[model samples]
Target chain A: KANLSLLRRPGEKTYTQRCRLFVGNLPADITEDEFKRLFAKYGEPGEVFINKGKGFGFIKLESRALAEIAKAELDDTPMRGRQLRVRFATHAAALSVRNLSPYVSNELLEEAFSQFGPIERAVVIVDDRGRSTGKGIVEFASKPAARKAFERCSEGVFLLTTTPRPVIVEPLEQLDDEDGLPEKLAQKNPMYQKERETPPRFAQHGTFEYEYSQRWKSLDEMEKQQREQVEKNMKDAKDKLESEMEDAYHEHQANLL
Target chain B: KANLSLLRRPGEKTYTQRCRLFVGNLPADITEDEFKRLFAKYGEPGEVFINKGKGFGFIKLESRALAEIAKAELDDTPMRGRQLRVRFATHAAALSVRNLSPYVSNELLEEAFSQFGPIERAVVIVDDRGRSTGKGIVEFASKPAARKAFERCSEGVFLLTTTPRPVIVEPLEQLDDEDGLPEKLAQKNPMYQKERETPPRFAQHGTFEYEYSQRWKSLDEMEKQQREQVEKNMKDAKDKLESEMEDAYHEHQANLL
Candidate 1:
C-alpha cells in the first residue's frame, strides 16, 4: 500500500543471492570464456554460465564481497552491444548445471545429477551454433533430495571435465512445469503443452537428448550401470559432507516445492 | 537471501502507486502538452507533469484503470528518440508539486502548501530553459499534516491552475533531510551538509525563493495574511474531507516519521 523498503526484509533472509549473480541481457553469442573475461577484472568469478538464447545467465563469483563489487560494476555494462543486467541470483529447488562443455550430452547430464540422488529431470540444450548451451537443469526426485544435493555442493561440485568453476548448482527459479507428470497427464494442463512446445531443455529441439529417445539405445549399454555405481559411491562419499553442511535451510527449504 | 517474489508482498500493501504514473526518460524539450497528447490517446490523462531536466515526471491519470491501460500502452514507447520508462509512482512523505504555471514562484509554491499546515519547506526551481520548470517540492511540517494534506486530496487538488492535473497531492518519497535543522545544526550531520549544498529544491539556486529570503519582504505583507486566512478557512473546511479520507492509513501512517 505504501513503501516496500521495511517490508523488503521480512526476517533477514540472506542465502539466495550468495556468491551467485543473475546476469541478464547477455548477447546470444556470448560464450563462457568471454563472460569470464568480462567479469574477472572485477573479481575472479568462480563460474560463468549462460542461458544462451534466453538472453540471461548466472555467474557464481568467488565471494559475496567480490560478487557485490562485480555486480556494481558489470550490471548495465555493455556487452556485445547489449546492456548487461547483473543482480544476485535467487535460490530455488531445481539446480542449474553450468560451466559445462559442448560434449555434455543429455545422457552425461543425467548421469552427473544421478550421483546426488534420483533425478526428476536432467537436460542439456544447445545453442543456435549447434554447440551445447553448457547449461542444464537437474530437478531432483524430491524436495528433500534437492535440498540435500544443494547442501552437498552449495559451494558446487565438478561435472567431470566441467570448467574449474566447479559446477554451479543453484535454484532453478520458477517451476514452469511439474513436468514430473507423465507426458499425457502434464499435457492436460492448459499451459503445460504450450510451455514445452518451443524447445525442450536440451536433449533436442523437441525431445530430450537421450534419456528416453534414440541415443538411449546407444548409451544405455553401460550408462545406467555407470550411473548406478556413481550414485552408490557418491552417496557414501557425500554423507560425511552432507551432515556437516546441512544446517539452517529449514526456512529456505520450506519455500521449495 | 532468496527470491523477492514471495517476500515482495509482506501483507499486500497497495495504497502507493495509485493512479499515478512515474514516467521516466523525457527529452529535455518535452512539454506537458506533448506528454499529455502522447497518453491522452489511450485515455484522457488527469495531469501530465514532467521533470524535464531530470528526464522523469509523474502523470496523475484519470483512474487506475486508465492509468493501468495508459501505462501499458506507453511504457517503453519511443518518444523523442528515447524509451519512456512508465511505472506506478511510489509514495513518500514529501509531496512533489507540479502541473503549475511557469509563473508559480517560491512564494506561490509555499503559499499553496501552507494551506494544509505549516510547511517544512517548499520551493520552485527552474529547468534549463529558465522556465518555472512547473514542478517543485512541498514538505509538510510534520508527518501527520503530510498525511492529512494527502488525505484531504489524495485525488489531488488544484494549486490554482498550475494545470488541470489537480495539484498532485500525494506522499513524497523520502526525507533526504530533516531540513528543519537551522542550517548549522543540520550541518552537523556529515551527509546533511553536502545534501543541501547541491540544490535547495528551488527558490533560486542558493536558498529558498521567499520563505526566508528577499521576496519575503515583498510578498510577506500580503502573502502572509493571505496564507494565514486560507489556512484557517481550509483547516476548518478540510476537517470534513480529512475524516472521510482518513480511514486506513494506520499501517501506512506508522511508516512516515
Candidate 2:
C-alpha cells in the first residue's frame, strides 16, 4: 500500500535503506498466509511463518515506521485467542548475538533510545519465515549517536518490567566462543593449529608475543585502580539528574503535583 | 582408593579426559550423597545428584582406574535395588545449564573420571546454603578431549544408545533466542552513550569496520549441512562396520575349522 514515500530518500543507498521488523506471540491457530497478509497492509512484508507446535511465529516489515507501529499496536493485542508481542527485528552481526531488547516499550525505550539523535536508518531481523526473535537494532544519523546507543545498551540484559524474564543486551560485534577462553588456555587448543602453522609469532604454549604494548596481562595496578575510580566518576550523570529533579520540586513548592 | 601407579603418566597430558559419568537404572530409594559416598572409596568426588522423576543422574570420578572399575563391576551391579548403568557423562558445550539430578554420586565420578585424563578441577556449583545447585564443571587438562567427550555423548535431551530406553540428559544450554541473527543483532541496545562525535569512517551505514566476519548465515548453513552429513555418515559407518564384521566372521570360521 506504500507509494513514493516508502521509496528511498535522496542520497540513501537502496541496500542500506532496507530494514526488517519482526512479530511474535502469535496464537496457535494463526495461519502462515494470514501472518503474511497482516503485514502487507503496513507496507511490504518479506516473510511470514507460524510455528507448528511451539505456538509462536513471526512476520517481517520493510519499513521502520511500520515496524514501530506494529510494535506499539500489536503488543498484548488478542489475535485468534493469543496476545501478541512485536518489535523491530535485530540482524545478527556475526554467528553470535549483538543487540538487546527495549525493556520497556514506551519512554524507557523510545525517549531514551532516541536521545542518541536522529537515526539515519534502523532495522531489525526476522527469521527465514519472519518472527520476532526478541531483539532489535538502531542506526543513528552519526557514528557518535550509534556509539552512544551502544555504550548505553551493551553488556547488559534488560529486565522487562511487564514480563518476569530479562532480555540480554549486547554489542553488535562480539568475541567468538573460542576467544572467550583465557589467552593461555585458548592457545593450547589444537584448533589454533592453522594460526600456529602460519607464524612462529603465534605462540603454541605459554608466553604469547604481541606487537602492541597494551596487552591484557600488562595492565598495571595503577590502571586497575584508575578503572575503579572511573566507576565513581560515571555516577555524575545520575547524580545531576536526581539533584535537578529535587531542585525543581522544592523550588515550585506549589503543592508538588 | 587407587595406587599412584595407576595415575596418568606425566607425558600423557594430551590424552582424552572424560568430563562426567552417567548413572542410570537405579532404585528410587537411593539418594545423591549416598552414591557419592560409595564412589568416595575410590577418589574425591565433586557432586552427586539424582534428578527427580528420571532414570539417570550424573557422577564425577577423580581417576580413570576408578572409572574403569565402576564401568566393569558396576555395569550391571545393583544400586538402589536395581542394576546400575554407568558411562562417561556428555553435555552440550555451547551453553551453561542448571537443575541436575540429586541421586547420582560425586565421589565415584572423580575416582573414575581421573583415570581418563588429567582433572584440573571439579565442582558441583551450590547455592549459599551449601546444597548442590545440581550443576557442576569438570575442567580437564586439554580442551580437545573434553570437547570430544562432550560432543560424542551429549544428546541435548536424551542419551539414546547406552540403554534400551532413552535416558534423560540434563538440560543443555538454551539456544540463542535469535539463533539465526549475526552477533551484531544480539544487543539491539548496548551500554554506551550517543556522543555527538565519532569517527567519520563509521558514520556510513553498513560501512563501519568490523574485526570479525558475521557468521549467522554461514553457521546456519553449516549446521544444516552437518546434520544431513552426520546422518548419512552414521548410516554409512554402520553399513561398513556390518560388512567388515561379516568378512571377519567368515575368515575366523575358515581358519579355526
Candidate 3:
C-alpha cells in the first residue's frame, strides 16, 4: 500500500499536513479574539491559544491547506500595528470548512469548489432540525485540485451568503471513501432520501446528490414563509400611513370651510 | 418667481439647500473625531462641532442631497454605541469624494455615477505639483440622481482606491455652472488645454470632452508606471530565489557523487 500513514502527517507538507499554524511576534496585550480575527480572514481556526506574555501564539485551523496558505499570505505581514511571523506548525487534508453561514447551500458550495477543479464530493453540515451548522467538507478529484480549491476559497472572506462572511477551507485528515467516495456514499444516507421528496427552494439551479443537512427543505420553507410575512406587513403599514395622511388632509379642508 | 429664496432654503429641499445635519441625543463624551467617523460613511463633512454638554451636535457636509440622505438613513440609528437622533438642520448638493485612490480614474467615477443618472460634470482634485489630492466632486443631472448616488456610494465604503479607503459622496452648496456646463466650459480652462495633449491611459474606452483635472493624466501615468515596476520587481525576486534553491540542490548532489 502506498504509505497511507504519510497522508496523516500533521503540518508543513502540502498534501497530508495537519492544519496547525505557528504565529509569532504578536503584541503581549493581544487577546485571543483579536488574534483569531487576523487568521479568520483565511479560515476559521479550530483552536487559538495565545500567551500574551510570550508574544507568540498557535492557531489550529479547520484544514491543513488553509493553514499553509495563511502562513504564506500573512507571514511577516503587519497586524495590530506590528509585523507577524506566520509558519506551518508540526500538525497536519480532505478540505474541511467552517463558519458556513445559514444561507450557504450545498449547491453553492459545490459551485464554488467547481471553479477551482472537479469536485469528488462535498458536504454541508446541518443540525437535526435541518438548520445548517455552518460547517462542511469537500473532496476534490486530485490533490492538486484540492490544493487549488483550498487556496481560492481560503483567500479573504468567502462570500457565498447574502452577507459576506469568512469561510474556512482545509484538507481533511482522511478521505471518506470507505464504502465509496463522499458523494457516492452520502447517497445511501437517509438525508438523500428526504432531499428527493422535498427539494430546497434556494437550490433553484437544480439539485445534486451531495452531503447536506437533511432538514434543509423544512428550514428553507420556514424562512421563505417568514420573508413573505414581513413583506406583506410592510405593505400594509405603508398603506395605513398613506391613508391616515389623506384623512388628515380632508380634515384640514373641513376646518378651512 | 414663487419664492426662489424658498428654493434656497437651508434644509429639507434637495437643490439650493444648505447641507447641514442636526444630530441629537449624543453621549456627552463624544469627540469631534469620533462624531466625524460616524457620518464619514456618506461623505466628508466640511465642519463638525458638538455641544457635548447639551447632548447634540451639528455637521455641515458638502451637499444638501447627501445631507438629506444621511439624515434619512442614519436617523434614529446608533453611533458610538448610542442611538443618535439625526435630522436635517436648516442649512445645505454637489457630492464630495475623498481619498481618490490611484486606481480610481475619472472614467470609473463617471460610470459609478451613471448608474444613478446622467452626470452634469466631474472633477478629480490635484495639487500644483501635478499630484492627486485624493479628493473630487461630481454633479448629477437632478437632485434625485445626486441623492441616489450619495446613498449608493455611502452605503458601504465605495472602493475607489487600490487600498480600502472611505470615498465620501456629499452634495455641494454651489453648482459649478457659472461659466456654462462643466464639459463645455472646462475645455476653455487652461487645465483642460494641458489635459488635451497627454490625456490619460484609462480614458481609452473612447474619449469624451469632459471636465477633469489636468494633473490626472500625469498622475495616472505615473501610478501605472510605478505599479508595473513593482510587479516586475516581485517577479524578478521570486525567479532569483527559486534559481538559487535549484543551484544549491544540484551542488549538494554533486558533493554526494
Candidate 4:
C-alpha cells in the first residue's frame, strides 16, 4: 500500500477530522447563545445552532483538530441542569436539509426525521435576526435510517408546517461548502493567500519524493487556473467599461456637432 | 482528494505523527539501558538503539501518536550532562547500510558518508553479543546527498575498512522489516493477527466505505497467502516425519528376519 502518512498534505480533506460536534442533553431553557458561550472557551465554532425542545444541537468548530480537542476537554461536563454529551456528530447518519421553512422548529424537524429512524439530533440554522437560513441538519443513529429519511425527502417536499416547504436532503458531509472560508473570502484571507504564495518547502527534503512532486504539480495547476480566471474576469470587466464609455463619448461628439 | 482521516486504518502508515524520534546531543556514557529507561515511561518503543560515540540515536515508539507524546514530555530535559535534543527523525534524509563489517563503528560510518554530505547520525547496530549486527543506518542532512550516497552504494561495495566489505544502501523507510517485530513474532502479534482476521468494521458506518472495504479485501488477500504458506510447511513436515518412521521400521524388520 502507498504510504498515506507521507502522501497527505496539510489542510487537505480536513473534514475527516470532522469539526462538527453533536451536543446533547442540554437543559430545556438552554439557548444557542448560552450553548455557544459555554463551548466558545475551547475554540471559536464556525457555526452553532440549537434544537429548542429536543435539547440537542450541533457546533461546527474552526477545524476538526480543534473539535477533537474540545470534545476531549468538555465531554460529559456539567452544564446547567444536565451533563453535556459532547461527541462527534454522526456525519454518515446525518442528512443536510436545505430550503427548510424559516419558521421550522427543532421539535418539528426532529418529528419529521424521527419517522425514518431514532433521531440523534436535529438543528435548524438561524442567523442573528432569528430567522432560519432555510436549512437544517437531521441526524439519525444509523445509516439505514438516514437513507430512508433521505429517500423520503428526495421529492424536496416536507410538511413541517401547514404549508409544504421544499427541502433538499443529502448526506451531511456531501455539502461541500459546509466548512472553511468561502472562495471569495478564502481568496481575501491573508493566511490563505500567504499559504498559496508560499510554495511547498519539502520538495528537496521530505519523504515520498513522488507525492511531494505530485503536490507541487497540482498546486501549480490550481494556481494557473486561478490566474486564468482572474485575468478573464478583469478583461471582461475592462472591455464592458470601455465599450460603455466609448458609446457615451460618441453621443457627446454627435451633440457637439 | 479522499478524506485521509476517515480512510486511514490504525497502524496504517502513521509516519505523519512520526514515531521515530531522533535523540541527539547525548553524553557519550549514556547506555541504551539508560536511554530506554528514560523514554520507556511514555510508551514501549518498538526499538531504541543509539550510535556509540556519536551522542545520538533513534527511538521508534509504538505509534506515531505515542512518539509525539513522548517528544513533548521529554524534549529539552536535562539528561546526563547535556539538555536532550529530541526531535522527529528525518526519514527521507536517511538510508540503511547493511552488510557492514562487524568492527564498523559510528565514527567510521559517519566518516564514510561525510564525503556525500553533512552526516546527521550514523549508527552501527550492535547485538547483545557486543558485536556489530553487520547493519547500520546513515542519515544525511539533505535528501539529495542521501540519494547520491544511496546510488554510490547501489553497486553493493563500500571500502570502509582494510578489507572491502559489500554494503547495501537504500531509503531508510524502504527497510520496512529493519524495525518493528521480527517475522516470527509479527506473525504471532495480536495486532497483526486481529487486523488480519477482522474484516474492517465501520465500512457501513464511516465516510470512506469504499476505502474501508478495499482494506478488508487486501487484508484477506494477505491472510490467504499466509495460510497457504503455513499449509505447505505443515505438509512438508508431515512428509519428512512419515518417511523417517518408515525407514526405521524397514531396518527393524530386516534385523528380525
Candidate 5:
C-alpha cells in the first residue's frame, strides 16, 4: 500500500520488493513447492508468497540484478498452458536523467555516476530514426548506490562535464501505453491474415537483391558473444552466493546442491 | 533410440517427442515429484522423465500447440538460481515449404496449407531490409495434419496458385551459427562498456524531432489485443482438456482439481 520502493536490506541477505516480481496468470491448481522450485535456477528467492486461488503471487529474490534477469527471461512464460506475466513489483534502482548537456555521451554520463557505486546500465534515449532525445537512463547495481548518485544531483556537484546547469534526476518511469498491442500479435498469427492490410515485403519483391553485409553479420555475431559472456559472468557470480548460503533446496538433495 | 518424430497417438491420448520439451539445467537436488508438478499447468504431459544427476530431463505434452506455447514461455526461465534451457526434443510438426511463388502472400500460403487440417503458422521468409527469399514455413496443430500437407506437396497437387512448377518442401533447418554470440551479450552488459567503440546516438543529438506516429501507436495497441484474444481462445480450449483427463495432479489437491 505504501509508495513502491527498494527496501533497505537490514542484513545483506534481506532485500526489498525492488527485486520482487508479481507473477500473474498462475494456475489455481499449482502448489507452493512447484512454484518455488520452478524459479530456483535463478537464485534462492528470499520469499515466495502466493494468493493461492487468485492466480497471482510474489517472489523477492536476493538481488535487484537477479530479479531483472528473472523478469527478462520469464515474463510471458508459460505454466500449465497459461502465459505467466512477470513484472517488477516495486521501484527499480534506475534513475532517468533529464536535461543533459546536448553533447553528453554514455561514457561521460556513466563516468559521472560510477563514482557512486557499480553501475548496471546507462545509455541515452535514441529514437528509431537514429536520433537522440537529450535524455539518458543510469542504473546502479544496488539501491544504495543509486541513492548516492541521486543525492549528488541535488547538490549540483555532479555534472556530465558540459551541462550549463545541473541535470535533473528522476526515477526512471515504466512504460505506460496501451490500446494497440494485440493487433500486432494478431498480425504475427498465421491464421489471422485479415490483420495484414498490405502484402508482406517478401511477397512484394520477387527476390532479395541485397545480402546481409559483413557489418550486419558482425554486429549480430558480436551481440551473441557478448550475451553469452555476460551470462557466464552472472552464472559464475550466482554460484558463489549459493555456495555461501546453503538453503533448504540444497539440503533437499544431499548429493546435488 | 527411434527416429525422432510425431508419434502416432493410437487413441489420441498419446503424443510423441514432437510435442515434447527437453529441459536442461535442472538442480541436482530436484525431485521427480516437483519436476512433474512444475509443468502441470500446461497440460497433462504423457511422461516426465528426468536424468537427475545429469541436470536435464524431458516432458511430452498433449499437443504440438501446447508444447510450442510452453517452450516459448518457459525457455531460459530460472530454476533455483540457474537458467533453464527448454527446447524441442524432437522434430516439430512443421514443414519447411520452399520454392514459393514470389508473389505468394501469407494469405495464399496459409489458404493452401489449411486444407490439410487446422493450421498453426505459415509465412513466407523475408530479410531485414524487406525482400522475399521465396521460402516459407508452415506448421500444423497435429503431425497427421502436416503429414497430409507434405504428401500432397509431393504429388504436386498443392500450389500457391502461381508457382511455375512443383515447389520443393523440406524440414526447416535450425539456425547453426557460432563464435559471435557472447560479444553482443557483453555489449548489453552495463559494467562492460569497453565493448562500445562508438558513442550512443542520444549523446550525438541534443534532441529528437519526430514523434511516433499514430500508425505506430495503433499497431502496438492492436498487437496487444490480438495476443490476449489468442490467449483467451487457448485457455478456454485447455479448460475442457483438464476436465476430461482428471490427472494425478488434480487429485493431489482436492480443491484444485
Candidate 6:
C-alpha cells in the first residue's frame, strides 16, 4: 500500500524489508527529476533511480508519509501516456544471500574495499551466469569501523539483483546463505553463458588486467579451507581471551575486597 | 559557504556527465526521511547521504533544476546550531598510502566484502604500531561490473552518519595515491606527526600495506621500467599493425578504383 516499515533481527526471522512503493508502469518520457518533484511535497524520497533507458525511474520515499501522499495524491498521475506507480521502492533493500551479485574477483575487490576503511577481507557470490554475486562484506578494524562504513556507504548504489531490490547497505544480520553456495555458480548464469559464446581473444582484449581470475578456479577450495581455519583459530583465541578476562576480573575483585 | 553546486565537472573541463551536490551545515535533526523530503522537491536524489555527527549530508539530485531547488531553499535553511550546506558531494574522498589495519585481519575483511560482489583480492594495511589506517578498495571483475556495483550500492542507508546526517559517494578517479602524495604529506603533516612525549600506538597505525613502503621506495624504478616496456612494445606492435592495415587499405582502394 504505502512504505512498509519492516525490521527483522538476526537468527530470529528471515529479513525482508521492501519500500512501501514499487512505481512501475512507466513511459519513456519520464525522468528522475520529474519523479522527485512528484514526491518531494509529500516527503523526501530515499531514492529516485531511473532504469538504464531513462524512460522510467522509481522514487523511494524515506517514510510512509511521503509514500502515502504519493499513493493518495499521485496514483493517477500521468506521464507520457502511462500512469506512474507512486508507492514504495518495491524492494525494501533487504540483505539476503539470494540477493547477492556473483562473479567476484577476490584480489581486486579486497583492494577496492580497503580504500573505504581497514577491511579485514571481502568476497562476492556469483550466479550460474558467471556474473557477480551482489552480496559481500568489508570487515573493519573494529565493530565501530564496520558500523561506520554501513552507516556511511550503504545506499543508492546498485548491487546484483540476485534477489529482490537490494538497497546496498543492510544490517549484517540480514546476510545468510544456509547452503553456502560457492562462487563457481557465477560461470553458469545465463549472462555468463552468453559471454562464453564470445571468442577468448575478445574476452582477453582489455587493459584492465585479468590477473584476479588466475586463481579463480582454485579459490573455492582455497577460501573454504582458509576461511575455516582462520575462523577456527579466531574462535579459540577469543575463548582464551574470555577466560583470561574472567580470571582478571576475579583477581581484581579479590584485591578490592 | 554552504555546499557548492558543481556546475561543471570536478577538477576538469566537462566532457562527461558527472554532477555533484554538496550538503553541508545541515540541521542536526535532519533524518533520512526529512532529508529525502527536502531534496525530492527538486528531483530524484540519486545518492542522498549525510554525515551523522557533522549535521550535514549530500544528495545527488537528478538534474540541474532539482539541484537549484535544493540550493535555493535548503542551502541556508537553519537547523540545530548552524546553516546547512546543500550542494554537490564531490572532492574525492580522502585517501592514504599508510598502513590499513593490523587489528582486523584482511581475511575477515575479504570475507565481508565478498558478499557484496566479486573481489579479486584483499589485504589489511598495518603500521608499525599494529593498528588500522582505515582505507581500501573492493574491485570488481571489470569496469562495467564495477560500475554496476558503483550504481546500486553508492547511496542511502549504507551511508548514514552516527548522527541523522548523511555522507557522500564519489568515483575514485585514480587509484588512491597512485603517486603517493597523500601518504607523504600525511607523514609530514604536523597533525599526523606529533611532538608528543609518548609515541602513541595510534600515531603509527595506517591503512597502507607494508608493501607500499617497499613500492614507495622503488616506485620510480617500477614505473620507469613499466612505462618503457609498455612504450617499446606498443610502438613495435603499432608499426606492425599499421603496415598490415596500410597494405589492406591500398589493396582495397586499388580494387575499388
Any runs in candidate 4 off by more than 4 Å, and if so which?
A1-257, B1-17, B93-257
**How do the residues B54-128 of candidate 2 rate in per-residue lDDT, one tens digit apiece?**
767777565443454455345556665776666665443322222233321233223323443555544344443
Per-residue lDDT over B63-165 for candidate 3, one digit per residue giving the tens place of the 0 to 100 score: 4445644664566566668777775553223577664543344445555566777774555654433334666667665678878778865553344322333
| Fnat of each prediction, in sequence | 0.00, 0.00, 0.00, 0.00, 0.00, 0.00
DockQ of 3: 0.01
TM-score of chain A of each: 0.32, 0.36, 0.32, 0.38, 0.46, 0.33
TM-score of each: 0.23, 0.24, 0.18, 0.23, 0.31, 0.24
Candidate 6 C-alpha lDDT tens digits along A1-257: 23333211111112112324556667766667776776666544564577736455655554332344355445545666875554433221222222332322333334444444555334444333333444544334345555544554342222221111222444443311111122243243444344333221211222121222222213323444555555565546545544664576578689999
TM-score of 3: 0.18
List the DockQ of the predictions in order.
0.01, 0.02, 0.01, 0.01, 0.03, 0.02
Across residues A1-257, which tens digit of lDDT does each residue of candidate 3 receive? 23322222221233323456778899778999888888766544566789998889988765443554466456656666877877565322257776565555555566666666766445676543445566777656457877876775544334453322346566654311111112233245444454334321112122121112122223334444655555565546545544664576578789999
- The digit string of per-residue lDDT tens for model 4 on A119-227 reads 7567676543344566677767568988887776553233454322334577764321111112333244344443344222212233233333343334434544655
Q: Pick the candidate with the highest TM-score.
A: 5
Candidate 5 lDDT over residue span B91-118, tens digit each: 5577887655445655566666877887
Q: Estimate every model's Cα lDDT from 0 to 1.
A: 0.50, 0.42, 0.53, 0.57, 0.56, 0.40
By TM-score, the better pick of 2 and 3 is 2
Per-residue alpha-carbon lDDT of model 6 for B1-257, expressed as tens digits? 13323232112222111235667766666788887886555544566676768876666654343344355445545566775655444333221111122222344334544444555433344332333344344434335544544454332222211111111123443321111121233234343333222221111123122222222324323444555555565546545544654576578689999
TM-score of 4: 0.23
Query: What digit string (tens of lDDT, one per residue) describes model 5 on residues A146-224?
Result: 8877776654333343222245677775432111122333355454453234332212222211121122223334544
Candidate number with the higher DockQ (1 or 6)? 6
Q: Model 3 chain B, TM?
A: 0.32
In candidate 2, stretches whose alpha carbon ends up further than 4 angstroms from where it belongs are A1-170, A179-219, A250-257, B1-47, B51-257
* Runs with alpha carbons beyond 4 Å of true place in candidate 1: A1-17, A93-257, B1-149, B152-257
Question: Which tens-of-lDDT digit does each residue in A45-116 have in candidate 1?
Answer: 555667788988777654444555466546556676987777665434467665554444454555556766
Model 4, position B134, has a per-residue lDDT of 69
* Candidate 3 residue runs with Cα over 4 Å from true position: A1-257, B1-93, B175-257
The candidate 1 chain A region of ten consecutive residues with least summed lDDT is A175-184
Per-chain TM-score of chain A in candidate 6 equals: 0.33
Which is the winner by TM-score between candidate 4 and candidate 5? 5
